């Protein structure tokens, strides 16, 4: 299984998982920081990224790590209140600037490309206090934001991620509130940060576009959650609708108006205004594109950036109640299959990132891919020699290779989550994604490989695997 020629193997980070130096050097606080502080076990032991793997500190640790791995592409995101304390450039933090330049040049002079994003779940406190994505004001608050760092860094850098997973983001954040803000609005939140969030990226595109791209020659694109979904029995046609509508849910949701159209899926909209209709709203729960917003989004994105970590069954769940949520919007309930193996909701079933894969191809004009983020996590006690993960990382390998080859997916950077053990959000430290190692109770952050790290960087060295 040879991969093609100039194949991109990444690994990845975020930098409120990674960095630490949360209030280092003039830092503006971001909602995880605020989060995190507040504790009431939102997170797996009141834990927070204060320090994390200390990466704001050791990036000369990271940047061993990523030699030795072999990387051609390194993918880490910016934090915006690292930048710009306050979200603007009003004040701009120029030690911020240094350490991510640094970490350009670093990258560059050892061969290594970066892939950036600009905005991984962290926003700003101070545009969270401003309403954040549930308020229009946010739109240009990104884009000044977006602007800011193509000027910054687009000299060297020409893979540009804007948000970071826009639909988990808007479901988390503002849905479920299980992410900061920690607010939930089951039904009504997701979808009206869902609107902004696609009109904030849109016109960060098309400020790349218009002041950036000829001079940088760069592409830019935003990353997408997907699970890849299969109808829980498989003969059953409200459930193959189902599983067709949950993915048309949850993934083509944003990447509709993005790739296609400017507008969201028609079951979708159907949906949504049908129930708020009969919920005695005056609006449909969805907020509309105007003709001019279709016109701005439409053909955003220079590439499709997905994230893949696992695949669940669906089955018809008609919304008889007229409950309120985006679960019973779409009308579905999602399952593991019991006979799967799972680290916590990472179930493993390596053929679905294939599927996915090929759903993409077909649905977005054979688009260029990245996969910009896949892994697996350990549960603590973690084992260095972790020879069980190393045979899921294989298996989903071959599965990339079969997409490419079979079914011809223009699949050029896989990323792997991540490069270090890291805080997994809600899950803390208690959920260990790296390929390498790293102890949270030694101030040093020492960072050690797992079995998967040699395993991986001989794929790398071998570009694919027998
Ligand atoms: C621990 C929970 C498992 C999380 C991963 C599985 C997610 C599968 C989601 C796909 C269903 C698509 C329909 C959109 C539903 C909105 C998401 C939600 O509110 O839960
Ligand atoms: C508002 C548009 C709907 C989009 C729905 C897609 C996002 C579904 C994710 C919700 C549950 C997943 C929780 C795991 C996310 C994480 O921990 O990183
Ligand atoms: C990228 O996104 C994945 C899925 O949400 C996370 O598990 C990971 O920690 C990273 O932030
Ligand atoms: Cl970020
Ligand atoms: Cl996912
Ligand atoms: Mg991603």
């Not at 599983?243 to 993934?251: D, E, G, Q, S």
């Not at 960072?447 to 794929?459: H, L, Q």
């Amino acid at each position: 299984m040879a991969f093609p020629a100039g194949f991109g193997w990444a690994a990845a980070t975020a930098a409120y998982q990674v960095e630490g130096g949360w209030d280092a050097d003039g830092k503006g606080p971001c909602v995880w920081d605020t989060f995190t502080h507040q504790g009431g076990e939102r997170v797996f032991k009141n834990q927070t990224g204060d320090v994390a793997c200390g990466s704001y500190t050791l990036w000369e640790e990271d940047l061993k790590c990523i030699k030795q791995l072999g990387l051609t592409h390194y993918r880490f995101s910016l934090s915006w209140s690292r930048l710009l304390p306050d979200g603007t450039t009003g004040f701009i933090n120029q030690k911020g600037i240094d350490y991510y330049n640094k970490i350009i040049d670093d990258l560059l002079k050892n061969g290594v490309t970066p892939i950036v994003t600009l905005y991984h779940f962290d926003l700003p406190q101070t545009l969270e206090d401003q309403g954040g994505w549930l308020s229009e004001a946010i739109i240009e608050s990104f884009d000044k934001y977006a602007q800011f760092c193509f000027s910054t860094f687009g000299d060297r850098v020409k893979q540009w991620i804007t948000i970071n997973q826009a639909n988990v983001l808007s479901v988390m954040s503002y849905d479920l509130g299980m992410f900061p803000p920690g607010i939930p609005h089951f039904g009504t939140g997701g979808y009206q940060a869902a609107h902004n969030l696609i009109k904030a990226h849109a016109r960060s595109w098309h400020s790349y576009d218009s002041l950036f791209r000829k001079k940088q020659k760069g592409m830019v694109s935003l990353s997408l959650f997907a699970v890849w979904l299969e109808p829980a029995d498989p003969n059953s046609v409200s459930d193959q609708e189902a599983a067709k509508r949950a993915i048309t849910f949850h993934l083509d949701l944003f990447a509709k108006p993005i790739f296609i159209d400017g507008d969201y899926p028609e079951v979708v909209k159907s949906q949504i205004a049908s129930m708020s209709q009969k919920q005695g709203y005056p609006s449909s729960r969805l907020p509309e594109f105007t003709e001019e917003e279709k016109k701005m989004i439409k053909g955003t994105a220079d590439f499709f950036a997905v994230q893949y970590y696992t695949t669940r069954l669906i089955k018809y769940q008609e919304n008889k109640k007229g409950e309120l949520g985006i679960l019973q919007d779409a009308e579905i309930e999602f399952f593991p299959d019991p006979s799967w193996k799972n680290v916590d909701w990472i179930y493993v079933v390596p053929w679905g990132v294939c599927k996915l894969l090929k759903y993409i191809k077909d649905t977005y004009n054979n688009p260029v891919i990245y996969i910009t983020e896949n892994g697996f996590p350990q549960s603590d006690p973690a084992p260095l020699d972790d020879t069980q993960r190393w045979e899921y990382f294989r298996q989903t390998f071959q599965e990339l290779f079969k997409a490419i080859q079979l079914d011809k997916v223009n699949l050029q950077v896989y990323c792997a989550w991540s490069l270090l053990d890291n805080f997994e959000w809600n899950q803390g430290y208690s959920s260990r994604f790296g390929l390498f190692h790293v102890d949270f109770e030694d101030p040093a952050r020492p960072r050690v490989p797992y079995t998967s790290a040699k395993e991986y960087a001989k794929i790398i060295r071998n570009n694919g695997l027998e």
